[PDB]
Design a protein around this ligand. Sequence first.
Ligand code: HEM
Length: 153
Amino acid sequence: GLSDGEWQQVLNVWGKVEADIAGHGQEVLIRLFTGHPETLEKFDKFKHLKTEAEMKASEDLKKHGTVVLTALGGILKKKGHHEAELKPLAQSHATKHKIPIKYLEFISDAIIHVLHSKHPGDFGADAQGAMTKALELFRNDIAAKYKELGFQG
Ligand code: HEM
């Protein structure tokens, strides 16, 4: 996947993320649910949100949003030595949450969108680089385990 240099850039940028996980976790999820309204239907818990406003005005989402960048954070610090921590993840989104690989494709772009909005001007090309190749690795390894289980949908 990536080289040390790129792993550097990845955990450096994770730097920005750790300084405010609930605010970053919140804007990503709000990035997803408004950009792609159908992802919202997957959370019985949030299907009740109708506006952007009502979304920001929600502590539960802020909460959920911290569970996620905390679980990702975990896997990203492994530097691709995540089967351990990803295996458990692959089966729940596959079998119980039932989330399509494209929905994992969307949120990935939303990470990168989100970081440019919040850090416009110090999220450069090399960084953008290595963060994308790490979200791809993550995304491809899930694919791999989603294949294993026939989650064709
Ligand atoms: C991008 C990386 C993601 C990470 C790190 C992640 C992390 C997690 C974790 C740790 C849980 C709780 C434990 C479990 O149930 O496995 C969870 C729950 C869940 N995730 Fe994800 N998730 C990610 C992407 C997604 C996406 C893209 C969607 C939907 C488009 C999604 C939908 C859900 C749902 C529906 C649940 C359970 C709902 C609830 O809390 O009642 N996840 N996620």
